[PDB]
């Protein structure tokens, strides 16, 4: 169909999409013909660009502008044609199996999942999240709890990396499996250690999950350790499924996305209906992360109240203790699901409120109608804080309207201007570690 | 009195909104079916080989879909006590039960009533086949990369002592060569193979036997599955049952099943003698003990006179040579593997096989419909055999079923019209089958 | 598609062999041991025998001969005129392939080596520590003892020929036993040694147990005549009946004795003489005797004989169930966790009962010389352990001659009431069809 | 300060009379070997690379053999605390420890003919069989990876790069259990196995009682074998490998490449397939240059049918290695040889025998081109094992002052190449001790 020089390879499916119905295959193909192709292409490039020697992002992706991918139809199932893929993703002309699987992964979540809902109620949003993970063969039936979600920051310095490896090698010396946001630095070090420790302790089925969104994976290649890759429709459905599959959470330094994620966490942990649930939240870093955490906690205790630190707990420069506590909490998390009658792998009990599930358009009017009142209940005040925060993080990676920072005025944030005064040094502090301007009186 | 069972195999990871949907559907009129089938599942291997008498004893039995946050459970109010060893359900029985929950409630209920999958008109043949595939994929029944070894084994409900022995032997041979059996879940001809194949898999240290039994809600409800069946599948109607028999077999051995097997072959030949399927490899062997000779042959004549010597290519008869039937099968696998390899086709499912729409949809033997059934030699062989199958479906047991009798006492017998010699051959077959104990209800 | 010279590769036993050991196989194969290795190998290949014959079945293949090949990697086996039923489409049946290399394992590699070749010193073969440590290295080299194995092994004894009831019933015991995820070990033979495994199969099937272990133990003279039954997964051949019985005891976590005619009497008296010994008052080895309806009286006379000879203290080590298939499994399954605990507290292994003190008396083999028979001390002043040990050697010889015609009938210098119960049991067994041979 | 350990993998099912053998062997003079090797195994993974001083901290340590009816247990008096997690011994550390109980207490003590070349080879096999390292029915993927104890960072990176490429092709690594070049190949291999989903890595590390006494096994070694001497350690290196890859190990690579070319160039081994790739970074081009020159002159250019030199192409190093594997299988197939043990390879009994560098013997060593190539290299290795060892050991400093320097007989041109290679080896910083 094309006479040019176009290095091709035909890949068979590995670990997803393997048993496909015919009428599903058609659907896969008709979707790869829609406008969705760009995402499907750009994600598939980042998937084959994993663990690239050159530690770049935009420039790495621009080199392969000759790249393309096609969905090939066969009576049995389906195959992926790879025109001009990066050479590093192949050994002796065979695709590396990790990558293969993570490729067919992107077929699954971007063209099979993301297609059927986006190219076509908080109960629907959860059962749908469950369904995605079930289809991802990620909820293992009869699995004792060992999953420790690790949130963290895109860029991090050398000490912070070192310490997050140590937490990992510990987590792993205790036979605990890790999830992250499939990205780099903080989302990577914990697995990198947990492997070594998984090794030493002869653990034989290391789960290193990695949850992400269309807009993140299109630019950010999954770090190489990720052995299971899940892509969810939006951040909103990403954070929800983070929480539901976790048996522990360990926030790291990181800066902006972390802070935003913490508020998401807390406003589900402080809701009444969830005073019985057991999800250990240990924040941690290295010695030089002392002041950073400090001001974080100061911010929460001001906004949400001191009663908010019911739910968290800060260990500093004790890699071993963080893994020890996470290991001890695992029985309790089982039991706490035992007597609810709740799946060990999916926390159906945790009540996440529709405000936490509803997506925040980065529209200017959205922040201009935002509310920050101490009279608002702790839950509502925290959800609005998180939605403003996930909008700022989207203002550099989604680029849906980058010039709307001050297009007809600054984001009218009506309410206690002292909440913003606390974020003054907080936001500049993230800029300090390289992680009324935007608000309004 | 009341035991609560956990899932085993089927229904292990359920979404809440789904568990839920079971309990509603469990309350619908469908309930009696769900109960009947679950009582049958628990009465497998019953020391009493009684059909209706065995189930009528357990009238106090009843079953309840219980909801928990994790998943779903089953409440067993007065279960037959045999099915419990030291208080625990027999793991086999457990998994068969949760199979009835899968195909009876999550599968039958859902596609017939709630339009959750919209795009399913269930007349379009593409939709019927793809569905037959979704049913099977969900029963974890199709395996990816499973090199071909499934010998589907059609037979007869009641069979004499010799036929059993002979069919057990074929199974032993089949399983001495590491071939897995699939039957129609029942007793006799559908039990005897798996029963021997078991000793075969054993001697040959074959591990992970697959003894599939495929069935339909009316069959299972009256007839418990035989105790050997390892994977239970319940297809909505015979039509979907046969159609799935085809697609998942890599070989087919038709044992002697009385006048029933006659429409069986015809159905098989219908798809086989089709020009788009002149390339598909599907070993069709018939076989039987010494005495089954006469019975296979009188069949043979009829087929060749109605369809031709060309029909004799697709099948093969063998008699009292058990082993050779295992031998030809084990041989034909690699060719069947290949036949799929070049057509770019799944090993476990035969997508390419064109089963014809008139064979997918059901046929009702209305006295008007019967006589309009075109049966003459000009009409191509495909249509000839398929109408011959529908014509045999109605006239066979046209006197056993009291529906046929009452209707052939009102509107008269089946005055079918087509070609004189054909109704001669269609007769012959029945006069011989009657000679072998295997106005009339029919007319020219 | 097969010939009459076929070359079989190893399966499951003798897989990794050093060249110097490979040589040892061939030199022992050319020595006088050959007939044994020949007869046994024919036997193994004649399992699943469609024809229900014994000696007539094996005498038909006089052309069969087997030879030890040599390659650099290991050993292979040369089958010259094997029987055809043990091959399918020119492949050897994988069952028979193991059991063949099994016989190669124990008859030539073991029995050859330990008897004479001083390649292994420190083999007094009289010291009872040596016999026991030897029985271990056998079941070890036979990959028979599994590390970290929760106890599920139930040894079954019984009669090689049994009516159709005794078989049907022993089948049900198996079915139930199996349904509880228990593994059976018998003496490899027919009838009472087949039915437990035969049923045990179906229920292992119903309960999705995925590693049946139908062990069968035997000794060279028996297997030469009796082909193992088709169910046997592990074949193990022990040098003599004595070392076979010791290893029975060591591997069992339960012993059921079925209706084995007068053939079980020495069997029970063998168990008792280790169970009633002192240092074994803490050990946990359930001993049920069972049978179907008609076996009732057959145990009856039996139990009487033991009570009166050894005492009612022998009823401590056994129990008796009749026609309750289901129960004999239920109790057996129940006893497993206790058997784990008793080996646990004692610091002992689960697969091998080191701590049972088996009498050196019972380990050594018995000569029923008329002098030795008379000198056999059969008095109740002697302790119950030695009383049962001497009562067994008495029954093994008197029941199972040319010498009672040369010298005389077996005038045992025993206590008369012991001799009185002895003859009364023999007469009661004659009522059940199960000057005399004694005096 | 005491813990008790159960057996993991090694020594798990033992007969009672064997157990007794373990105890009395432990109480003898072999105790010190056991203890210092046991100590080193518990010291794997330590951040401190002061191999010796590390052991000097834990001089309180001691180790007792515990009897039980079931088997054996290991009492640990004052064990290093880092080798535990929440009181649980690290499983890796558990296993290698019992492997020292295996090869040092059980094996070494008991075996101490050993004079007949066939007896030595069958024993090396019985040692590898008891170590459960020979897998029956195993496609050949073992690449033995020789190298040097301390290498700079560019050889460490390069050796790692090799491994990753080896791994990425589903190939297992065998090394000398140490660090430096014996670690980076496995360390790489690790990352790669993962990427390709290779789920059964076999990072065999073989060694001798003297080596492991002071040196903790590097943390990647899955399976630890300890052979009695070096002579048997090498012979074993040879029979289990399917290829060999020689990293830049300084002058320590000289006798090695000779020993190997000895068995390769002997006649009866003209049909065996054992690839030999020598690789390294760019800094190693001169270093391999003089090595290859010295050989082409002494043994002939026929010797370069047996060794190939690749420099700075890690991919190809593996690519060829991975291509060789099917050929090494077939080569064992048609000979009727094991795929796990190269029984057919003829090792000459002199290469199996230890060489004592007595002034008399090294002078008696025949070193002239008149003798044949197989013998020449053998004597050349026995030459270098004393010559270069001269400038380091006292037998080549102290003995050459007492009875005079080493006046070797043979041919002058050979001795010229020898000295010329050495002068090379001094120039890359890797009458003297030799005349
Ligand atoms: N609550 C809960 N139960 C689960 C889960 N996964 C598996 N199970 C098992 O379901 C089985 C049914 O026992 P129930 O007592 O009725 O469970 P329930 O809490 O919902 O009532 C339990 O097995 P069991 O008989 O109790 O054995 P075991 O759990 O003690 O080992 C339990 O282990 C889960 O994610 N949540
Ligand atoms: N058509 C088809 N291919 C399948 C099936 N299952 C697995 N395969 C794999 O697909 C490979 C065929 O590659 P292609 O030759 O391109 O098939 P294609 O023309 O239809 O695209 C098979 O090669 P292979 O030679 O069969 O490898 P192997 O399975 O013997 O290892 C096998 O690895 C199936 O059910 N149908
Ligand atoms: N007696 C015996 N023990 C064995 C055997 N195999 C493994 N073990 C284990 O030994 C462990 C007990 O620790 P030890 O320190 O050795 O006991 P000991 O004092 O009697 O020597 C148990 O693990 P655990 O987890 O502590 O006990 P459990 O819960 O598994 O039963 C037990 O399972 C065996 O063949 N026999
Ligand atoms: N040389 C050698 N042979 C081994 C090894 N391991 C297993 N075998 C097998 O021994 C079996 C006997 O076949 P032969 O044809 O006699 O082998 P040979 O030439 O090497 O002597 C072969 O099985 P097969 O059924 O005949 O063929 P295959 O498909 O299993 O490979 C072969 O694979 C080994 O480490 N080395
Ligand atoms: N045993 C084992 N098992 C796995 O699954 C692994 N995945 C990645 C590694 C490597 O990660 C570390 C990288 O840290 P680095 O040395 O580059 O600074 C290496 O020390 C390696 O052990 C690894 N090791
Ligand atoms: N799961 C399992 N595993 C083995 O290893 C087996 N070996 C033999 C059998 C058979 O036992 C019965 C034979 O008795 P039959 O009724 O045929 O006379 C068959 O119905 C089979 O189940 C078997 N089953």
Q: Are both B217 and B289 inside the same structural domain? A: yes
Please indicate, yes or no, if residue D185 is contained in any of the structural domains: yes
Q: Do D122 and C18 touch (CB under 8 A)?
A: yes
Q: Which ligand is nearest to the CA of C343?
A: 3
Q: Calculate how close chain B gets to C93, using CA atoms only, in Å.
A: 6
User: Reduced to 3 states, what is the DSSP secondary structure of residue B311?
Assistant: helix
Chain A residue numbers with beta carbons less than 8 Å from the beta carbon of B352 are 75
Angle at B371 between CA B370 and CA B375, to 5 degrees: 95
Residues B60, B27, single domain; the answer is yes
Instruction: For residue B180, give the 3-state DSSP assignment.
Output: strand
Residue nearest to atom 28 of ligand 4 (CA): D137
Task: Answer yes or no: do A268 and A248 share one domain.
Answer: yes
D21 and D78 in a common domain: yes
Q: How many CB atoms lie within 10 A of CB B113?
A: 12
Phi-psi map region of A20: left, alpha, beta (phi>0 left; psi -120 to 50 alpha): beta
Nearest CA in chain A to D192: A96
Query: What is the Cα–Cα distance from C65 to C57, expressed in whole angstroms?
Result: 16
φ/ψ (deg, to 5) at A371: -130, 130
Q: Which chains touch C (3 or more CB pairs under 8 A)?
A: B, D
Q: Which of D92, D165, D197 sits opposite A202 (nearest CB)?
A: D92
Domain limit, last residue, from A340, A374, A398: A340
Structure-determination approach: X-ray
On whether both D299 and D400 belong to a single domain, the answer is no
Q: How far are the Cα atoms of A278, C207, D45 from residue B85, in angstroms, in the given order? A: 38, 10, 52
Is A26 a member of any domain? yes
Q: How far apart are CA A397 and CA D80, in angstroms?
A: 49
Å from C148 to nearest chain D CA? 9
Q: What are phi and psi of A213, to 5 degrees?
A: -130, 155
Torsion of CA C275, C281, C286, C287, to 10 degrees: 30
Distance of CA C236 to the CA centre of its chain: 9
Residue C113: exposure state from Cβ atoms within 10 A (0-12, 13-18, ≥19) = middle
Three-class SS state of C418: helix
**Contact assignment for C72 to D343 by CB distance below 8 Å:** yes
Q: Cα–Cα–Cα angle for A259, A261, A266, nearest 5°?
A: 95
Nearest beta carbon to residue B92 from set C98, C208, C210:
C208
Q: What are the Cα distances from residue B216, in Å, to A212, B235, B245, C16? A: 44, 5, 12, 52
**Residue B284 in domain:** yes
Distance CA D74, CA D23 (A): 11
Alpha helices in A183-255 (DSSP H): 189-200, 214-217, 235-245
What is the Cα–Cα distance from D182 to C327, expressed in whole angstroms? 61
Does a structural domain hold residue A399? Answer: yes
- Residues followed by a break in chain B, C–N over 2.5 Å? 438
The reply to whether residue C179 touches residue B90, judged by beta carbons under 8 angstroms, is yes
Q: Which residues of C fall below an 8 Å CB-CB distance to B?
A: 48, 88-89, 93-96, 98, 176, 179-180, 201-202, 205-208, 210, 230-231, 330, 333
Interface test with A, best of D170, D183, D195, D201 (most A CBs within 10 A): D195
Q: Among partner residues D93, D168, D191, which is closest to A91 by beta-carbon distance?
A: D168
Cα gap A283→A252, rounded to integer Å: 6
CA dist., res. D365 & res. D377, Å (int)? 12
Compute CA D326 distance to the chain's CA centroid, rounded to the nearest angstrom: 25
Structure tokens at A396: 């550099």
Mutate to test the pocket of ligand 6, among B202, B206, B208, B228 (most ligand atoms within 8 A of CB): B202
Give the Cα separation of C184 and C194 in Å (integer). Answer: 10
Point out the ligand nearest to the CA of residue C347. 3
Q: Which chains touch A (3 or more CB pairs under 8 A)?
A: B, D
Candidates D118, D136, D336; nearest CB to C72: D336
Pocket test for ligand 5, best of A196, A200, A206, A224 (most atoms within 8 A of CB): A196
* CB contact at 8 A, B23 and B88: no
State the CATH number of the domain containing residue B89: 3.30.1850.10
Distance CA A372, CA A393 (A): 19
CB-CB contact of B163 with B256 (8 Å)? yes
- Domain co-membership, A64 together with A168: no
Among residues A340, A366, A382, the one where a domain terminates is: A340
Chain B CA closest to residue A350: B69
Residue entry with tokens 């699987």: A101
Residue in the block written with tokens 């049958």: B40
Picking from B304, B275, B274, B251, the residue whose alpha carbon sits closest to that of residue B386 is B274
What is the DSSP track for C280-319?
A: GSS----EEE---GGGHHHHHHHHHHHHHHH-GGGGGS-E
- What's the structural domain count of chain B? 3
Q: Which residue out of C97, C173, C206, C233 would a mutagenesis test of the B interface target, given it has the greatest number of B Cβ atoms within 10 Å?
A: C206
Q: What are phi and psi of C164, to 5 degrees?
A: -80, -30
Q: Degrees (nearest 5) of the Cα angle C133, C138, C143? A: 125
Q: What is the 3-state secondary structure (H, E, C) of chain D?
A: CEEEECCCCCCCCCCHHHHHHHHHHHHCCCHHHHHHHHHHHCCCCCCCCCHHHHHHHCCCCEEEEEECCCCEEEEEECCCHHHEECCEECHHHHHHHHHHHHHHHHHHHHCCCCCCHHHHHHHHHHHHHHCCCCCCCCCCCEEEEECCCCCCHHHHHHHHHHHHHHHHCCCEEEECCCCHHHCHHHHHHHHHHHHCCCCCCCCEEEECHHHHHHCCCCCCCCCEEECCCHHHHHHHHHHHCCEEEECCCHHHHHHHHHHHHHHHHCHHHCCCCCCEEECCCHHHHHHHHHHHHHHHHHCCHHHHHCCEECCCCHHHHHHHHHHHHHHHHHHHHHHCCCCCCCCCCCCCHHHHCCCCCCHHHHHHCCCCCCCCHHHHHHHHHHHHHHHCCCCCCHHHCCHHHHCCCECCCCCHHHHHHHHHHHHHHHHCCCCCCEC
Cβ proximity of A308 and A270 under 8 Å: yes
Q: Tokens at residue C418, please?
A: 């012991």
- In chain A, which residues have their Cβ closer than 8 Å to the Cβ of B70? 337, 341-344, 346, 348
How far is C-alpha B197 from the chain's CA centre?
Answer: 19
D168-171's contacts with Cβ under 8 Å and 24+ in sequence apart are D168/A91, D168/A96, D168/D192, D168/D195, D168/D196, D168/D318, D169/A91, D169/A92, D169/D196, D169/D318, D169/D319, D169/D321, D169/D322, D170/D141, D170/D196, D170/D198, D171/D141, D171/D142, D171/D143, D171/D318, D171/D321, D171/D322, D171/D325
CA distance B354 to D354: 76
Chains B and D touch (3+ CB pairs under 8 A): no
Q: Does residue A264 belong to any structural domain of this protein? A: yes
Please report where in the chains the tokens 């476990």 appear, as a residue: B348
What would the two tokens of residue B352 be?
């390419």
Phi and psi (nearest 5°) for B253? -115, 115
Q: Please give the Cα distance from D334 to D328 (Å, whole number).
A: 10
CA C54 to CA B413: how far, in whole Å? 63
What is the rounded distance in angstroms from the CA atom of residue D37 to the CA atom of residue D34? 5
Contact C207 B91 (CB under 8 A): yes
What is the number of the ligand 6 atom nearest to the C-alpha of C233? 5
Q: Within this chain, do residues D162 and D250 fall inside the same structural domain, yes or no?
A: yes
Q: Tell me how far the alpha carbon of residue C35 is from its chain's centroid.
A: 22
Which of B8, B91, B171, B175 to substitute to test the interface with C, most C CBs within 10 Å? B91
Pocket of ligand 5 (CB under 6 A): A 192, 195-196, 199; D 187, 190-191, 194, 220
In a domain, D226, yes or no: yes
Identify whether B34 is part of a domain: yes
Sign of the Cα pseudo-torsion (D221, D227, D228, D234, in order): negative
For chain A, breaks with the C atom over 2.5 A from the next N come after 120, 435
Instruction: Tell me how crowded residue B380 is: count the other CB atoms within 10 A of its CB.
Output: 11
Candidates A365, A428, A402, A372; CA nearest to A437 is A428
Radius of gyration of chain D (CA): 22
Residues near ligand 6 with C-beta < 6 Å?
Answer: B 195, 198-199, 202; C 198, 201-202, 204-205, 212, 231
B130 occurs within a structural domain: no
Structure tokens at C105: 């394992």
CA of C137 to the centre of ligand 2 (A): 48
CB contact under 8 A, C89 and B202: no
CB-based contacts of B242: which residues, under 8 Å, 6+ apart? Answer: B267
Task: Verify that B176 and B311 share a domain, yes or no.
Answer: yes
* DSSP 8-state class, residue B104: I
**Chains B and C touch each other (3 or more Cβ pairs < 8 A):** yes
Q: Which of B85, B95, B203 sits opposite C179 (nearest CB)?
A: B85
Pairing of strands A283-285, D72-77: unpaired
- Structure tokens belonging to residue C197: 């495994």
Q: Do D16 and C136 touch (CB under 8 A)?
A: yes
Domain CATH code at residue D126: 3.40.50.450
Conformational region of residue D282, where left means phi above 0, alpha means psi within -120 to 50, and beta covers everything else: alpha
Residues C211 and C312 in one domain: yes
> How many residues are listed for chain B in this entry?
444
CA of D102 to the centre of ligand 3 (A): 21
The residue whose CA has the least distance to atom 23 of ligand 1 is B6
Same domain, D189 and D53: no
| Touch A-D: 3+ C-beta pairs under 8 A | yes
Distance CA(C58)–CA(C62), nearest Å, equals 8
Specify the DSSP class assigned to residue C414. B
Distance (Å, rounded) from C-alpha C149 to C-alpha C182?
Answer: 12
C163 with C310, same domain: the answer is: yes
Burial string for D385-424 (b: 16+ CB within 10 Å, else e) reads bbbbebeeeebbeebbeeeebbebebeeebbebbeebbeb
For strand A90-91 and strand D224-226, is the pairing parallel, antiparallel, or unpaired? unpaired
Would you state the structure tokens that stand for residue D3, as one six-digit string? 């813990």
CA A251–ligand 2 middle distance (angstroms): 45
> Whose atoms come closest to the Cα of B199: which ligand?
6
Rounded-to-integer distance, Cα B392 and Cα B395, Å: 5
CB C94 to CB B45 under 8 A? Answer: no
Chain B interface residues facing chain A, Cβ-Cβ under 8 Å? 12-13, 15-18, 68-71, 126-127, 129-130, 133-134, 137, 142, 144, 340, 343-347, 349, 351-352
- Residue D48, CA distances (Å) to A168, A173, B12, B37, C146 in order: 21, 20, 50, 69, 40
Same domain, C80 and C158: no
Answer whether A123's CB lies under 8 Å from A216's CB. Answer: no
DSSP secondary structure letter of residue A274: G
- The CA-atom distances, in angstroms, between D86 and each of A328, B212, B250 are 11, 49, 55
- Identify the domain containing residue D402 by its residue range: 355-427
What are residue C228's phi and psi, to 5 degrees?
-60, 150
- Residue B76 parent element (H or E): strand B72-77
| Closest CA relative to residue A222, chosen from A96, A121, A399, A322 | A96
Hey, are the CB atoms on D190 and A199 less than 8 Å from each other? yes
Asked if residues B227 and B194 have their Cβ atoms less than 8 Å apart, the reply is no
CB D164 within 8 A of CB D188: yes
Contact in structure between D147 and D249 (CB atoms under 8 Å): yes
C-alpha distances out from residue A177 to A185, A193, A326, Å: 18, 11, 11
End position of a domain, from candidates B342, B373, B393 = B342
């Amino acid at each position: 169909t094309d006479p040019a020089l176009r290095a091709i390879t035909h890949i068979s499916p590995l670990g997803s999409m393997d048993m496909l119905s015919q009428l599903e295959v058609d659907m896969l193909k008709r979707t790869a013909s829609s406008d969705l192709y760009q995402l499907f292409r750009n994600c598939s490039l980042a998937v084959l660009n994993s663990g690239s020697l050159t530690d770049n992002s935009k420039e790495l992706l621009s080199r392969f502008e000759n790249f393309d991918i096609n969905v090939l139809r066969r009576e049995r199932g389906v195959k992926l044609e790879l025109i001009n893929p990066p050479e590093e993703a192949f050994v002796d002309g065979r695709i590396i199996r990790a990558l293969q699987a993570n490729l067919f992964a992107v077929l699954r979540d971007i063209l099979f999942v993301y297609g059927q809902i986006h190219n076509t109620n908080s109960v629907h949003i959860t059962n749908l999240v469950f369904s995605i993970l079930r289809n991802a063969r990620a909820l293992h039936v009869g699995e004792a709890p060992n999953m420790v979600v690790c949130w963290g920051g895109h860029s991090i310095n050398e000490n912070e990396y070192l310490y997050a490896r140590r937490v990992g090698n510990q987590l792993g010396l205790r036979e605990l499996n890790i999830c992250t946001g499939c990205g780099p630095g903080a989302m990577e070090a914990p697995m990198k250690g947990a492997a070594v420790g998984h090794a030493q302790q002869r653990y034989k089925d290391s789960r290193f999950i990695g949850m992400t969104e269309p807009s993140i994976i299109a630019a950010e290649p999954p770090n190489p350790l990720v052995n299971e890759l899940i892509i969810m429709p939006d951040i909103e459905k990403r954070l929800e499924a983070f929480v539901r599959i976790a048996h522990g959470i360990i926030i790291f330094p990181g800066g902006v996305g972390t802070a935003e994620e913490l508020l998401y966490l807390l406003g589900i942990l402080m809701n009444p209906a969830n005073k019985d649930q057991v999800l250990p939240l240990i924040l941690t870093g290295p010695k030089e992360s002392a002041d950073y955490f400090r001001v974080l906690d100061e911010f929460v205790v001001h906004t949400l109240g001191e009663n908010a630190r019911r739910h968290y707990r800060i260990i500093i420069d004790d890699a071993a203790e963080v893994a020890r506590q996470m290991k001890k909490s695992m029985p309790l998390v089982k039991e706490n699901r035992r007597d609810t009658g709740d799946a060990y792998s999916f926390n159906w009990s945790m009540r996440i409120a529709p405000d936490l599930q509803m997506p925040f358009e980065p529209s200017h009017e959205n922040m201009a109608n935002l509310k920050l009142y101490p009279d608002q209940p702790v839950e509502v005040l925290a959800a609005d804080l998180r939605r403003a925060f996930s909008g700022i993080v989207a203002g550099n990676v989604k680029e849906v309207g980058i010039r709307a920072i001050e297009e007809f005025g600054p984001y009218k944030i009506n309410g206690d201007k002292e909440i913003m005064r606390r974020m003054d040094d907080l936001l500049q502090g993230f800029v300090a570690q390289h992680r009324i301007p935007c608000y309004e009186i």
